[PDB]
Amino acid sequence: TCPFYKKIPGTGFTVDAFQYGVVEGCTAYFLTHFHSDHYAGLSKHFTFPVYCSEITGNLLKNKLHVQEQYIHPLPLDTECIVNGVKVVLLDANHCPGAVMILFYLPNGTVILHTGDFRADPSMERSLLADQKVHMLYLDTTYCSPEYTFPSQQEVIRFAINTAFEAVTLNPHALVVCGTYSIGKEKVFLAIADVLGSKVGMSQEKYKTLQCLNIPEINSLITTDMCSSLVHLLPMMQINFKGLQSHLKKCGGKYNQILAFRPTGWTHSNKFTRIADVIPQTKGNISIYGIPYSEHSSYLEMKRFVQWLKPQKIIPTVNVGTWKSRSTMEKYFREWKLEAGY
Ligand X SMILES: OCc1cn(-c2ccc(Cl)cc2)nn1
List residues binding ligand X (CB under 6 A).
305-306, 309-310, 312-313, 332, 335-336, 339, 341
Of 35 and 302, which has the nearer Cβ to Ni ion? Answer: 35
Buried b (16+ CB within 10 A) or exposed e, 142-156: bbeeebebbebeebb
Of 135 and 182, which has the nearer Cβ to ligand X? Answer: 135
Decide which of ligand X, Ni ion, none touches 35; Cβ closer than 5 to 8 Å per partner kind: Ni ion
In the complex, least distance from residue 314 CB atom to ligand X, rounded to whole angstroms = 7
71 neighbors 61 (Cβ within 8 angstroms): yes
In the complex, least distance from residue 118 CB atom to ligand X, rounded to whole angstroms = 19
In the complex, least distance from residue 148 CB atom to ligand X, rounded to whole angstroms = 20
Of 265 and 335, which has the nearer Cβ to ligand X? Answer: 335
Which residues ranging from 114 to 173 are in contact with Ni ion (CB under 5 A)?
A: 116
In the complex, least distance from residue 305 CB atom to ligand X, rounded to whole angstroms = 5
DSSP string for 95-146:
STT-EEEEEE-TTS-EEEE--S----GGGGGSGGGGS---EEEE--TT-STT
Site size toward Ni ion (CB under 5 A) is 2
- How far, in Å, CA of 310 to CA of 239, rounded? 44
Decide which of ligand X, Ni ion, none touches 310; Cβ closer than 5 to 8 Å per partner kind: ligand X
CA geometry: angle at 87 spanning 86 and 93, to 5°? 165
- How far, in Å, CA of 67 to CA of 46, rounded? 8
Of 37 and 77, which has the nearer Cβ to Ni ion? Answer: 37
Decide which of Ni ion, ligand X, none touches 313; Cβ closer than 5 to 8 Å per partner kind: ligand X
Decide which of ligand X, Ni ion, none touches 332; Cβ closer than 5 to 8 Å per partner kind: ligand X
DSSP string for 206-225:
HHHHHTS--TTGGGTEES-G
Tell me if 300 contacts Ni ion by CB under 5 A.
no
Of 150 and 310, which has the nearer Cβ to ligand X? Answer: 310
Of 271 and 341, which has the nearer Cβ to ligand X? Answer: 341
φ and ψ of 133, to 5 deg: -110, 125
DSSP classification of residue 338: H
Q: Which positions ≥6 away from 339 have C-beta within 8 Å?
A: 306, 309
In the complex, least distance from residue 304 CB atom to ligand X, rounded to whole angstroms = 10
In the complex, least distance from residue 112 CB atom to ligand X, rounded to whole angstroms = 13
Which residues ranging from 23 to 42 are in contact with Ni ion (CB under 5 A)?
A: 35
Amino acid residing at 239:
N
Residues that bind Ni ion (CB under 5 A): 35, 116
